[model samples]
Target: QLTAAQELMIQQLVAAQLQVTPWPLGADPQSRDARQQRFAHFTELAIISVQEIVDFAKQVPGFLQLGREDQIALLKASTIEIMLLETARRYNHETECITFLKDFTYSKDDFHRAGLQVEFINPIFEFSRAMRRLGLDDAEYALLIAINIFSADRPNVQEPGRVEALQQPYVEALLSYTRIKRPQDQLRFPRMLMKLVSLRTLSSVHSEQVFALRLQDKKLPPLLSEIWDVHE
Candidate 1:
């Protein structure tokens, strides 16, 4: 399952692909150069997304030791990246992560190109599988703890009542710890159904609306990095 944030990013990727930044729609659908150029925009955005993930991966060690509140903060930010990956892989990570992307590790490419730690993301890769194996993963579980930050589930075939049945406990946990408890947190957690959204390569991406809400609630870091403003 995808978090609303992941869903939002996915929407943005798809919309951008099918709308703006698209390949010329009527280009000869057969020429190799045409085909390459057609996917060029998608690949370019993937390069950018891969860059963000690489940067985030370098921060994973601190995230593992975080208090619950800070852990949620890390995840909330990572969700943006996860949505990006979902789009990058065309929503089939198994094809990438479990295969060519397995040993070679494509996300590694993103990091190297971005000039961050080459191995910084390895643990996050393992953590996601570990979390799911233990059944503690959820919509909010986005992957890394590494990749969890950038993937999303498709919105099709959603069974009604399924979301609440799963998210209720995760949502409830926030109440016992965070100041903006689910009592408050719960208020903003929308009851989403299968619906089309986003402009990312996939059908999920950040929405201006929910992103505005997330910003208002203080769940995310500023979009730009002001290095001098940094304080640990």
Candidate 2:
């Protein structure tokens, strides 16, 4: 780990871009007609959304020109933070939970700050629970377990210990499960992945900007409530 001073230096370097303000939605419409065809998903979509993630996933030109490492790094950083957030949430430590995301920039304009809740998180947890039931497979398991470690604060769950015994097995499983053939398989779009991993992995660093971003990709529906509606 880097020294506190070093960490501060590293933080200063990339903070601006990481916590950017979203470009005004091109049209910046004042309101959406609930009955309009395009507005059909509005009921489930957050009031404010950005198109950055969707653009990234589809590889639309002019998106963030990021390298693979940066993209993966984004995921790693956010995932770690998110895990801790879950831990805090389970323990009923809201103040501490909010502080754990200090690395990410935020604005009062963001949805979470404004109290806009995305209901999809419920389904995501349910699906993860299902995966946990089937038994996590090595990397898959570690990913699940790592995520759950933070979630140990969940109702009825126990606080995770700093277990030396379980740590090695979890890592070994993750290492054995990583796929070399296609490390880029689903992680193709750095922009999309970064936005998403950021969203799923942490509470909110730059939630104001990120929350305003919209993702309409079919592949990412499971991450959204209206977008992933069973009947839709």
Candidate 3:
């Protein structure tokens, strides 16, 4: 039931937010030193993505209306979820691991060396594969990220009423676009939302791990510290 104008708005919104800051594709390395260099890039990419998520939120229609504090609050609360959604495409389901640039991937051992524990590492691969199976296109991905921004229901929201109202359009656009894009997959929309539910819990655990590493004197970057909510 959307007007032609509304449809165009949705299309524009998707296009604007679809661009990701490309992570540097590193040469696959052999030496331990080279491997650690690649790991440095890995952390860089993850930290940069926090700003990318916030930049995308600033572009959402009602996001600025949420006021400065709440805007930061929403980003603070949901950046990890949106980060995973945005970066899931980089995961190589075929290889069964995280694919960085140029098909270079980090194995569970590599992840552990970089301080992500095996328990956390295993779940990330599983979640990444599940997201890949969803086959989300650019438009769907945009709506999904938008939904998480407005969907931040943390009890401290400055204006809960406005936040709830902002979420409606993204949900409707998701349904409207999904119907047009995948008319046969009646279950796809709900299934995608369910993925978010799973992502939320996993993202939290991921944060806790990062925080724990930070306690061990790991030098986390300022950008990552924002997403991880470091107090020191």
Candidate 4:
């Protein structure tokens, strides 16, 4: 059973997470112009998503207690993972596409039209499909994101032990919550952790796509470039 304090912590995490608002894609064009325009629209959404992630992180209990440098290191390493997770959460199985807010939905072809290569796009859709199958609730998603953010092995973190300490409670919260929520399903928590492993692989594939776009002279939004460590 979660103590009262632990229950309140989980509530706070979910409340902060629900505060992230989605942005609209605004336009969908055609042909090569479609590629440029769609990519640009995705970048704009990414910038907004990153800002929202930072805001959500600030509200995670004890996140701001980390050293400034460590916080940056953690965010830089984990933002893509969190972004991908959020994308999966927004996956619309009925339409077989990802929905942003109310109207914008992008299928695989839409992503291809945006210049994302098939190799990167296919796994993303696959991951999203699998994640949606798990039927995670808002509390579970919030805790999982917090767990990803507090990863101790992120590059350049000055205090791995402290980061690990911060991550432990969320892990416990997720495990306990999942057990209570899915009493009939024995493997839900483990299955969710497996998704984190897949998330790392997807993160690397995404970096490769970002590099490919750079080769094509596509410009990433400044915040996206900085956080993802993209360079000229």
Candidate 5:
């Protein structure tokens, strides 16, 4: 079990690493060029999120035990899922739209106008909505992201058992944190576990769809491209 100090330290660090801020756009809101620029910025933020996740995972006790290849493999397999979690925080369920950053929001109509295929965007929006419904705080979100990084079932992992062993501390930390935070909510930890389980399937769909769409067209930034190859 992580001491409360350890948990809070990691929690605070994760929150800082995962944080994102909106970039300012030019005044011409109607320009296609402006929208594409926003997408580019969004992609930039996504790449940063993946980088931070990988960096944090490496700090976990048993992660480096798997070596570089396995480490890359884990990130490839899980980056999109973590990105989805990060992205979900920016979602506004009541508005039923994605807020990629402050002051720059996109609705279904906006996405359609921007030529974002519904299939590519739909699962992400849904996942965000579901995550929002869970009402997870920053600490819980950080722990969930750690849990995802420590997932051992990714294909091509050289040390699956070792990786699984590494996940125990995080799982315990989350349970302990939850119990302390909500002592009366006897089922809270179980429900959060269920949310993580559900996200596994939804995460695959989110990655597969987005990757396929990117494959058919558009040049992904280098980091994004690398993680996509890693995922495959």
Candidate 6:
């Protein structure tokens, strides 16, 4: 039983979620200069995904009302989580691959060829596989993104109370939406919340992958480096 305001918030979030642009497929990884070209393409896609995440965050209700520093902190901490969720959404279970755009698909082998270790690649596919099994609709996806962005526990968030307040309604909205949409399944909401915890683990592993890349002298795109580069 969402209030009118909560329902409106969901609509706004859904619209913002829908606004993200699909990325273009990059160079063939099987060709010459494979590692460099493959990594380069991934870096390009990561930059675009970060930009889209930032744009999507700005449209989340009450997000811009927070202090600028808090906003940046939240974005810096949660961008990878949101990016992983978006990646999962594009996963193709039938092909056992992730489609970037049109027919451009990448299997776990392709990710390994792009210089990602099997340790990192395996968990990503596992997470995506579990998430796709949930069969969430667009509105549920939007609400989940909102829930992830408004997290109060992110480092350097000066106004945790305010951030927590912002997160509450979305959580409620998601719970109510899930219950009403799937009355037969009592576990849907909790299952989705579990994904958020899994996302944190994925983000940490992603940082490790970024650190590994840096050790190899692989240059991330400027924006990707700014947000994800693991500084010693």
- Pairs that collide in candidate 4 are none
Each candidate: how many clashes?
A: 35, 10, 0, 0, 0, 0
Q: lDDT per prediction?
A: 0.35, 0.31, 0.72, 0.86, 0.71, 0.86
Candidate order by lDDT, highest to lowest? 6, 4, 3, 5, 1, 2
The Cα error of candidate 6 at residue 99, in Å, is 1.2
Candidate 3 lDDT, tens digit per residue, 1-232?
6668557657877777765332234534344444445446667877677766767777788787778888888887787777666557778666666765665566666676555567777777777778866888877787777778886476368887889888887788888888888899999999988988888888778877877776655655667665575575
- The Cα error of candidate 1 at residue 162, in Å, is 30
lDDT of 6 by residue, 158-216 (tens): 99999999999899999999988999999998899899999999999999898998887
Q: What tens digits encode model 4's per-residue C-alpha lDDT throughout 1-232?
A: 8778679879999888878233224545455666787788888878888889999999988889989999999999889899899889999989999877768788998888788899999999999899877998888888899999999998899999999999998898888888888889988988998999998999899988989998987878778887764556
TM per candidate comes to 0.26, 0.22, 0.83, 0.92, 0.76, 0.92
What tens digits encode model 5's per-residue C-alpha lDDT throughout 4-35?
A: 76576566646655643343344365665655
Off by over 4 Å in 4: 20-30, 230-232
Q: Which of 1 and 6 is ahead in lDDT?
A: 6
Off by over 4 Å in 6: 20-32
Model 1, range 100-174, lDDT digits (tens) per residue?
233333443333232223233343344333323222222222322232322233222133243233334333432
Which candidate model has the greater TM-score, 1 or 3? Answer: 3
Model 5 vs. true fold: TM? 0.76
lDDT of 5: 0.71
Q: Which stretches of candidate 2 lie over 4 Å from their true place?
A: 1-29, 32-168, 179-202, 206-232
Model 5 has a clash total of: 0
